[PDB]
Design a protein around this ligand. Sequence first.
Ligand SMILES: [Zn+2]
Length: 182
Amino acid sequence: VPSQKTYQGSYGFRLGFLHSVTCTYSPALNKMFCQLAKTCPVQLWVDSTPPPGTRVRAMAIYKQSQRMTEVVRRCPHHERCGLAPPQHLIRVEGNLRVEYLDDRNTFRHSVVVPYEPPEVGSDCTTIHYNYMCNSSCMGGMNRSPILTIITLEDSSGNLLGRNSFEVRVCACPGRDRRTEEE
Ligand SMILES: [Zn+2]
């Protein structure tokens, strides 16, 4: 099982979220609610700047202990529907340097981009993720809750920082957020 323990590390790495309803985040639940294939802005916040060659990895895992060892991937239907391999749940949009990776021993998927510092006028770096299957899809997540783990890594894959958030991919994110909060 991939690690999910929060580790702010030497650079004081944490996550922030931009309300878009296509994407909305509940701090109380540490849970993002989003629509299929739509923009999910995830912000990287650091106290100090990580150095040359730093990478940002995203990986989905099942939250439930009974499915923890199972690989999260798209359902056959959504796989069937030229950068992201069709099996990958998580894509990155708006970035020319996206790497799609598959672990040789675990078969787990991840998507990696280089760390870039914040743009002018911003105090954070925003990455636009897309989730390519609904939480409810049979033969995929099948209503099993997932966690996205965001890892800051050096060029050799060593850990610099780790954060995570739950995700629900659904038709009406604002409504589902309200229900789970209340
Ligand atoms: Zn699906």
